[PDB]
Amino acid sequence: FEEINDFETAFKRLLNEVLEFDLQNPLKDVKKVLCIEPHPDDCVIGMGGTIKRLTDRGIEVIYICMTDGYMGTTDENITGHELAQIRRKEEEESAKMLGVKKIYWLNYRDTELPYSREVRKDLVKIIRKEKPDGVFLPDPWLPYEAHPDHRATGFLALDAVAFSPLPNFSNIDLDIGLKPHSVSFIGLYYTSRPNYFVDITDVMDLKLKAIRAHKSQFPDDIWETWEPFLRTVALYYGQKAGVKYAEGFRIMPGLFYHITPFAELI
Amino acid sequence: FEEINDFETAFKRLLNEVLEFDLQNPLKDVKKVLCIEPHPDDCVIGMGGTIKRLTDRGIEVIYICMTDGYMGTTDENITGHELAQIRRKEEEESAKMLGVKKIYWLNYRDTELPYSREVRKDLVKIIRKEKPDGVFLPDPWLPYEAHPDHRATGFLALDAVAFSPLPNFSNIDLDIGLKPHSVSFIGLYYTSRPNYFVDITDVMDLKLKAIRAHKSQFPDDIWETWEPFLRTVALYYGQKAGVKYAEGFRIMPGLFYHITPFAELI
Amino acid sequence: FEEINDFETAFKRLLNEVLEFDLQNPLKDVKKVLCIEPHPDDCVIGMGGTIKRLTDRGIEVIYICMTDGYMGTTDENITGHELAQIRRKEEEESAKMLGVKKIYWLNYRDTELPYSREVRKDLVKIIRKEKPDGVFLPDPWLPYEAHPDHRATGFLALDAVAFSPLPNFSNIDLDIGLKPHSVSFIGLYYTSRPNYFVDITDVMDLKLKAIRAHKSQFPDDIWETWEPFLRTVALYYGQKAGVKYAEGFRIMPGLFYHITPFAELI
Amino acid sequence: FEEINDFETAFKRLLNEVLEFDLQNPLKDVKKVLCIEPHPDDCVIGMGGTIKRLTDRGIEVIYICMTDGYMGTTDENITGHELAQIRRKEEEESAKMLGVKKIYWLNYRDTELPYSREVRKDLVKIIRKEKPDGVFLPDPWLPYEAHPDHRATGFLALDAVAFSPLPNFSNIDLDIGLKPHSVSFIGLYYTSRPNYFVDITDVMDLKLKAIRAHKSQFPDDIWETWEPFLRTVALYYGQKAGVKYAEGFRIMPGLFYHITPFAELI
Amino acid sequence: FEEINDFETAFKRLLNEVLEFDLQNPLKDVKKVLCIEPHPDDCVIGMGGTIKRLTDRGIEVIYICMTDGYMGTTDENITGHELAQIRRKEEEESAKMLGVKKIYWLNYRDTELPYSREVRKDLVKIIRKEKPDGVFLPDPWLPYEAHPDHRATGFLALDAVAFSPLPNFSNIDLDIGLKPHSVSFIGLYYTSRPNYFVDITDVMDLKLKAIRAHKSQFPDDIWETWEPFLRTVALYYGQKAGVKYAEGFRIMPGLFYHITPFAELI
Amino acid sequence: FEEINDFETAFKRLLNEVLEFDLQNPLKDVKKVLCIEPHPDDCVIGMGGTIKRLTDRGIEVIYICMTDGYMGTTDENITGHELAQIRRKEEEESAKMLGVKKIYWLNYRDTELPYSREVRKDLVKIIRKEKPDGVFLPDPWLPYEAHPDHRATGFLALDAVAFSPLPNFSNIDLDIGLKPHSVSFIGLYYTSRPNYFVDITDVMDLKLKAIRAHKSQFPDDIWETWEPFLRTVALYYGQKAGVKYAEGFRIMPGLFYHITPFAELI
Ligand SMILES: [Cl-]
Ligand SMILES: [Cl-]
Ligand SMILES: [Cl-]
Ligand SMILES: [Cl-]
Ligand SMILES: [Zn+2]
Ligand SMILES: [Zn+2]
Ligand SMILES: [Zn+2]
Ligand SMILES: [Zn+2]
Ligand SMILES: [Zn+2]
Ligand SMILES: [Zn+2]
């Protein structure tokens, strides 16, 4: 590689020959994935269509939900305890409509999710137990994301995936018979720099039915705003992918999440 | 909205019809605003002109100052306790010169402002009490902002505004008779992605006199650097707005601060 | 400066006359610098070539390593305690090969570096003791940096530099006879927005030998991936600087790290 | 007082003349008290009889409950969210049976109550709003108390009472129009060093009915153990007070909670 | 129990009939116990003899060590990383000499053991996996215990035992197939209020050989002080039990660790 | 020591021969001591008399004050910043009246002193710099001490003394040329289990003048209560020592602060 005198060549060779990074079929071998959502309803809102598509193709999809959704209401007659119970039933209904069979609830309180070692260990435990091929998580670099649970979940999910294979990390996991694990695939959903698209034209009406199942979050008057907003998001991704309705994801080789100044160039 | 096949149309309709988002007069009905500053002098440096303009138009402007300014000196003869006392008198003088009548001091120590639930609750209490129509806060995504108190204040102010209307958030506030509150208007000051401008050509000399009132922060020799820097900032904003001297703000609909991949497009 | 009617003029004058900012020879008077690395091997990987060039020019280079490298292995036979010992010897060998004489080990555990006042005070102590002219640190705004130790180190280094000269900050340092200190020079390594380059075509094979000295981190099979990745990075910086192999740095005047909306413009 | 040469005399004079400390009728003027409980059911279990006696005498009793009781079950079919909802209804029933009209729920999670400034501020807010004459709280020095929520509540309640009257403590409370407040009376319940007793012979069957109202906590099989345990506690206090069934409290002058080496002598 | 009019009767019946509390053989059915030690060497120093006695009787003894022993040296030539490696080998040798076959290392750093939910979860995981009949832990109420790791370990071990059987506590443990678990037996070692004794006259020379195996901690000159100190401790316990050399333990019914004012009476 | 068959003998030998523990003159070689106080005025109130006696005997006494005294007023007209300034001047006057030359201010805020590694390191730095022979600190086991700053200071002081001599603890101190340090002498003031007394009948009126110097803390009406309280405390210690007025201290050999079940027996 000392032979090479020009960046684009080196870059092309690094990606294509050295890393063998494929953006055309990057879910080739994947049989099990984790979707990590900050609140009940985030998996379905950000990639509900893709989830349905994967379950139909007989890929096993497992949700990890970081919080209980305790705060998500303006109704003074509903306690956070009542609302958590409700949003558990709602995500159970929603997850059944897409093919999703298992949900792990971390049960950190909505608005109170720590960026801490503790939460890294909670995720690394599940990854080591379920040995998934791929993990989906919200992009922590989404510009203007003011929800701290969202930002946190992103960094934690990356940290967890990064540390799952390190046997000195959360070592009691090994001592009780969980083996360390490398994930093959990482995809960021809720991203503004997607580089992989999935047509959801055919499943858009199911996706919206699975979102609406979260009745607590979507009364008629809120739905007036959110059905348009969601169709607009699907068109934004759609236009880039040459279809009506798409879901955007950012997929990179693991190496590019660390000390890569040209990471923004894929 | 199923009717729509292209993004730009959907985008235009979302902004114009669904959200009714106005960049021509977004302060229409605003009678009271909060300006949140990390240190004494930040409201005046970032939007002192706009504050004067608002008070002249008979709009009530209330400062929330996050810290005491304990660290802001190189003089070995001044203790942090002395400096805090001084910077309280300075901001009191400065605030009088602009039309500003109330300041809340959180009194967290300069350089030690936590990114915590506690501080969210301190802000949400004031918002519920003062029921402001609009809130101004420093842009936390300002590139190359190395002051941790600045970054923190931005995220906290957004969190506070987002959570003020949720009755299960800091619920003791309700139990002692503070009602939940929605803010109509959010504006980010100290931003590099402004999309709303205020002419301060006419109030620039008052703005500089109100900055200079912070004598502790601005001895003659420091002022040699800072009067130029401030004129340059006002020109940068000015050029974009077609005037000599402007203050820039980023204003978006509340919806766009959460899971909006096209947020950077306004 | 009231005279000026256009931004670009004011900008040019602010940079050239007021701030005297020089990008052609910014290491004029620099005799002593600190290189702050999150892990053992980060100084060598991010600016090993530049460090050699500085040593040869008789500039004193001191490493501060934030963590012990406890987690950096997939081998189930190596404890984090064994690995820390090993990576100490490796960085000692690597530091010998470049001209580096002194290493401070903070010994926070890999993956567990706090963003806290405590760690700010640990750095400020070293800066006040060594009174360095310049500090190098990894760019905390590097896009897609998922390693929390990296993000943390960047913000802490800037905080430390900013607070070293404040006598009310960590005041016990003064009480035991460490004087406050201003550093002249700040340079961000591992950056995607570099604006200063150093030719390392001549030292590239030494740099790779000094990286390979970290045997724990770079077995044959991993080096198949990392020798290409590093040549590609050096070309990326190289293309921008018009040479084969360069190391990129971002250098700005201290003022631009605070409330500067045109900071992105240098 | 320089006249005095013997401790017992000075001690007697300090208590009787200087402090005017009365153990015979120490609730003389009290019209409003707060009972602070770590979990739902702690007020009723530790002093349910005394509460009834006070409400019958037309004294206003307000509960502050620190936690939600999320963890208090071995039943794998009940979520912490369900159980919190349930224990809210149970304490509402229980509190109605005794004369208690108002409950504030802090809603910190069972087993997760922090010993933090935040929680001190939550209590000081309620004290300043309700201006109670007296506060009851569990004795933090109860030997062999392994429940961390119990230990925590005790220290926090004392801290809160101590800091309620300090206008520089949680100063935003004052800024929104809560005046500082001194409590006249402090009583520790769940104590092993009681020095004031209340006959509950006449209300013991109501106390047990109000405990049993917490059905979640007291199934038939658990009640086999807890009816005896509670009768035994009431006899232990009873024997000391010369009655069948009593509730023990430790009452001291505020001064004795700080730097008093003979505090254990009342 | 309404029948009873005097405490001593009720107390006797509570202990003997209701709780069936046995101080003659409280290890009756115990096949597996956990010994929790703050540092390498604490299990052997506090109850090494008892451990030997248990392994000879074919009872399975598992150590949980909370910290790595990083700080335990005055030798400036030994890093904390070197010392941890050493103290791992030492406790492995020591544990072999007593019958002990499993050690779990939490690897929190010596002097830095947090009193946190995280550490509770680490212990509860091991308890649920190993389903021990009994747990030994240092008495957190030991007067004049200044080592914060000691105090912490005590409270944490009690918390862990208390919370192991609650399915809503660390619920991910259940989701990955660890069942909740109740411990039958709790014994506090390093206690000044022991109420159960074990003769170690016959195993005292093995106990001292197993202590001495921690060479790092016990050079000749330190052993001059510690062999006497240990013989003195064994006599103190011995005198109370009517033997030369004993190890003291405090054993109570689980009920007495919560809201029991007469707990100090057994 | 195998020879010995009885505890009291072993105990006597351990104390007298092995540990050489002297309660008759335990300040033999002491030339320099630290007095650690949680608030300004705690050294003077707890051992002001003893301090004068030590100064007169030409022993160097250095105050470490943990907090700034920010909260200590009921006056709504005084800010915590004003009060800290004032209490600095007051402790400077008070310290002059006794022979005290040097005060280190940690400047943690009153009511907000952390029990953290950070604060341990702040104390260990001062101890290593001043190499004192002895340290005085408030007894953290003082029954009914409700002030969290007091409890915290005690544990921190002991931790600091324990860890000062460990070169792997706060190792950057060594890297900047502070040597590790063992203190010879530890004495607990504000204790209810004193075992060493100092006659202060001769200095009692100076002690009261040095307390009264803290005017902020002691207006006429408060002094009506505090002059009696202090005379009573001095008599309590006095009676035990067979004098009118004494100051009590608890002194033990360093070994007894760790795993010593008979520590209560001296
Ligand atoms: Cl662990
Ligand atoms: Cl497709
Ligand atoms: Cl506050
Ligand atoms: Cl009565
Ligand atoms: Zn969400
Ligand atoms: Zn600022
Ligand atoms: Zn690194
Ligand atoms: Zn309870
Ligand atoms: Zn230990
Ligand atoms: Zn005090």
Author numbering:
A (entry chain A), B (entry chain B), C (entry chain C), D (entry chain A), E (entry chain B), F (entry chain C): 2 to 267
Q: What did the paper state?
A:
Deacetylase from the extremophile Pyrococcus chitonophagus has been analyzed by X-ray crystallography, small-angle X-ray scattering, differential scanning calorimetry, isothermal titration calorimetry and NMR to determine its structure, thermodynamics and enzymatic properties. It is a hexameric, zinc-containing metalloenzyme that retains its structural integrity up to temperatures slightly exceeding 100 °C. It removes the acetyl group specifically from the non-reducing end of the sugar substrate. Pch-Dac crystallizes as ‘a dimer of trimers’, with two doughnut-shaped trimers stacked back-to-back along a molecular three-fold axis, with a 8–10 Å channel through the middle of this assembly.
Three crystal forms were analyzed, including monoclinic crystals of the protein-substrate complex (Pch-Dac-lig), having two protein hexamers in the crystal’s asymmetric unit and trigonal crystals of the unliganded protein (Pch-Dac), having half a hexamer in the asymmetric unit, with the other half being related by the crystallographic two-fold axis. In Pch-Dac and Pch-Dac-anom, there was no ligand in the substrate-binding sites and the coordination sphere of Zn2+ consists of the three conserved His-Asp-His residues and a single water molecule that occupies the same position as the carbonyl oxygen of the substrate’s N-acetyl group in the Pch-Dac-lig complex. Thus, with or without the substrate, the Zn2+ cation is coordinated tetrahedrally. Three of its ligands are provided by the protein’s conserved His-Asp-His triad and the fourth, in an unliganded structure, is a single water molecule wedged between two catalytic residues, His259* and Asp42. Two neighboring Pch-Dac hexamers had been extracted from the trigonal crystal lattice and used to improve the curve fitting. The same hexameric assembly is observed regardless of crystal packing and probably represents the biologically relevant oligomeric form of the enzyme.
